[PDB]
């Protein structure tokens, strides 16, 4: 198919790569554990 | 450089009587999911994960033969 | 031409003699994954409302993705350490979840319909479960091919085409998402396509030319269940692949 | 804000990150491949044009 | 090109038997529907969103197939 | 080149073993979920034999997909 | 270092200004007219291949 | 001749008018009269 | 090939799809106006150590071009106001005093030797004072085109082959530079070409092949003198067209 | 097309007349040269004329380069 | 097609005479410079910018000619 | 291509003449230092250099018409 061929493989490749090693740093040091402290924090009240 | 183009339509035709293999395969695994959950009305969380996991892994080989129609089709 | 809607433009530009920086430049499809970053950003950053404990109706639906990621990768790997590689169970989701509901918005754009990103992204998940598997496991690695007690003269017959299905997992796994992204947006623009041509001929076919519509409507409504249902698939199919890579069977 | 955690993100992602490099390096020489093909050797957006030479233009 | 354009005609009929799939598909997915029904009346209103979610998963099956024979009949 | 254009068709006819392997999956995961509904204590001992007999499936569907290949670039 | 004195440099050169700017206007008209020539149609750097349009070839 | 009838045409004159107006700036308000202070200043001292 | 040396290439790029911005972008004569701009605030910045007053020995330089430059605006336009037009006078002097000096050095770039740059900036400097010269004096700016006291019945003649020198005027103050520039270093390149291949014969050339290149080095002895002379005669004849634009004979 | 490489001749031909032109100039400096050094205080009373007798001779000099270039672009 | 570029390097070569009034004209320019500082020697420094504005603003009459011949040969 | 090689030789011979120039350049030049010199022989080391730059800017129009004859013997 014409359109999936071009020659920006490396372009596609190259911020697929880094939008994935951005979201995967990202997403692990800061955005689950904030959910992760509002799970640790809502228990910590429950017990009290 | 017709006849090229020719059997190029006509093998991306050939190449999507493949799907019929994969509706009823959807058919058959929500069939045996109603029939299961039916006959059981506590399966269904753990019969669910199960259900889609055979659906979207099996349609994916009907899925092969329409790529096989586009790689015909527009490659 | 009701392929067009996957054409790639350069907008920002850059270029050099000395080396080749035509790699790195703003694209269409960088564009979208810009976007994509800043929504994933968006829905955790300012969804807080200012570090509240009670969680506003907004951060309900990323609990929700949450929990349901983790319920489905403790059900898979489940072992002694199956949280160490959540972060990559999650990030895998996300980017196909945000990436199929951006594509849906009409005049948009699929990033999770270019098939050299996507079974690239399917091959490296593949090597990375191969040479994970070789390092924690030495040579009994292969032990993975052969399924159970079987009788041993259809053994290496079991071995060939065991391998063959082992490496067919490394563009199965991408060709699925592409293919029914792919065949969901180009099933839309077509149907849209001979629906116009419907409506451009004598006046009574506008009149009743709502049936048409309301095929597309129900085409449309169907294809954000194929989008989130590929999302889904995609993060179990790799937990089952990290489930055999790193325990053997 | 945000509070940076930081967690194991190397000592348990390596072999991912390794085939990252290495279907990186195999799509560069497979897109260095492509772009001299038939087809694509008259497109003028690829990068030959802007470094030096032009127009084999014999096929 | 009167070869490749009848060859096209060829093509989107071909393209025609991959809705088999789908009509024995969606018959099977209701089937499956009636006889848990009446095996369990009470577990009408958690059993049938997901017949009418097999019915749309086949049906878009069948869809895959109608287009490509609309490929081949105008585009 | 008569042979350029009928490998097409021969890409074309080699797919349709598909139909098999879609069908087979279904059947797999079918008595698989009859199995789970009808004994629940069965998942954990079962369920390697359906992914076992899935990949079976898919390579023995997958044989026409490499033949399809083999003819549309070798 | 260097103290900046006001010199006054726009009531005293105004018409260098404008028939520089008028110049410019000439030689971008004069540019685009000499970019489409039968020489000049196919040089891969022109920037008409960067905004869309792509080989008339037809000498 | 072939080597000074390119499409730099504009790319020449751009930055040639770009460092005319900044050399008649430049040497206008800073250079020049930095000279001429040294020329006021020994005339200054010389006077007395 | 001897006229290789004037190639424009093309090194930090920049492009786009939206605006033709390749106008401006990072080139070899781009490269070498930023050269000529630093080595001209080279002359005066570093230059002055400390702002001393004494003035040490590299400021003697920027001293003498000054006062020649000044000395020589002042037996020209001479007038009531002649200091107003004397920033033009000097930056127009530098830049060519620096871009043929700089032209000179082995493996760099003349930037004089574009006719499409100066015949531009001649033009410019023409029509500058054409408008000033409109602005200053009215109607009667027509009256520079009458010699002096001439009988009439020949005055007509003498008005349009007056004009006819009045407008060759607009190309022949840059293609005067551009001609010395470029012939010189075309003659520079020619005669190293032939004596490279005088050289490469039998190795009784080697032997007394000393003369042509000490003719070689008379010919860069020229080169600098043909260089200056030029970016003197450029500021003498467009101090003496000042003069005819502003004050009528 | 004998014309177009012809007119090639014609502006080739046609560039002698700047012979003239640069004789002209040259005498005219000269004389303008050798009248300040007989009588110093003659300058500004006579350059004028050696400016215009100069710009009469190169008109009459840029008749020739005027035909040379419709001889050459028309 | 080769009388096209064989016209064009013969006007290319007659387009180099004219060089000739302008290598006689920096001649009698300079040779009026020398009788005239020779015959008063305090003049140098009021005839010199005459000198070198009569040297350059002839020989623009030779590089006029000059640059036919270049036009010629390179255009 | 025996005819532009043949037209390049012409074009080399007419490229000769413009030399003339110089040669009666440098002469007058010269002509002149001697009949400066002759009329007051203490302004020799003021008038002389002026000769040689008299000398120099004359055999560069000698030379730019060489140079043209360079190029159509070769390049």
């Known amino acids: 198919m014409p359109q999936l061929v071009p020659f920006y493989f490396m372009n596609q490749l190259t911020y697929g790569f880094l939008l994935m090693i951005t979201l995967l740093i990202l997403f692990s040091q800061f955005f689950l554990p904030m959910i992760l402290r509002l799970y640790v924090s809502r228990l910590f009240i429950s017990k009290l | 450089m017709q006849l090229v183009l020719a059997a190029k339509y006509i093998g991306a035709g050939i190449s999507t009587i493949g799907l019929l293999g994969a509706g009823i395969g959807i058919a058959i695994v929500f069939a045996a999911l109603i029939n299961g959950v039916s006959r059981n009305p506590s399966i269904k969380d753990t019969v669910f994960p199960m259900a889609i996991l055979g659906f979207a892994l099996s349609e994916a080989t009907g899925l092969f033969c329409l790529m096989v129609s586009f790689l015909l089709l527009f490659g | ?194 629906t116009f041509n419907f409506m451009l001929i004598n006046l009574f076919t506008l009149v009743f030319g709502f049936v048409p519509l309301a095929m597309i409507l129900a085409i449309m409504m169907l294809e954000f269940a194929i989008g989130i249902i590929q999302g889904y698939v995609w993060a179990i199919l790799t937990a089952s692949y990290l489930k055999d890579a790193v325990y053997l069977h | 804000m945000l509070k940076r955690f930081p967690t194991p993100i190397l000592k348990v992602y390596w072999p991912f990150f390794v085939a990252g490099a290495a279907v990186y390096y195999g799509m560069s020489k497979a897109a260095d491949l492509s772009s001299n093909t038939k087809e694509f050797i008259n497109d003028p957006r690829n990068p030959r044009f802007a470094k030096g030479g032009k127009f084999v233009e014999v096929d």
């Not at chain 3, 509901?101 to 990103?117: C, E, G, N, T």
């Not at chain 3, 399917?122 to 009788?151: M, Q």
Request: hydrophobic letters at 55%; one cysteine or more.
């Open chain 3, 1 to 194: 031409s009701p392929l067009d809607q996957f054409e790639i433009r350069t907008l920002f530009g850059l270029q050099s003699s000395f080396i080749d920086l035509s790699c790195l430049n703003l694209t269409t499809f960088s564009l979208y994954t810009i976007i994509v970053l800043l929504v994933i950003t968006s829905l955790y950053t300012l969804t807080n409302n200012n570090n509240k404990i009670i969680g506003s109706r907004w951060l309900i639906s990323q609990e929700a993705i949450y929990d349901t990621i983790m319920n489905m990768t403790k059900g898979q790997i489940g072992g002694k350490n199956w949280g160490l590689y959540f972060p990559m169970i999650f990030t895998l989701f996300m980017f196909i979840f945000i990436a199929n509901l951006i594509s849906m918005i009409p005049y948009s754009f699929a990033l999770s319909a270019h098939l050299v990103f996507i079974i690239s992204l399917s091959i490296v998940i593949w090597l990375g479960n191969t040479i994970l598997g070789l390092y924690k496991h030495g040579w009994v690695f292969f032990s993975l091919f052969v399924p159970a007690g079987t009788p041993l003269p259809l053994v290496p017959l079991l071995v060939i085409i065991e391998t063959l299905s082992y490496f067919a997992r490394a563009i199965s796994l991408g060709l699925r998402l592409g293919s029914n992204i792919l065949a969901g947006h180009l099933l839309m623009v077509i149907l849209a396509g001979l």
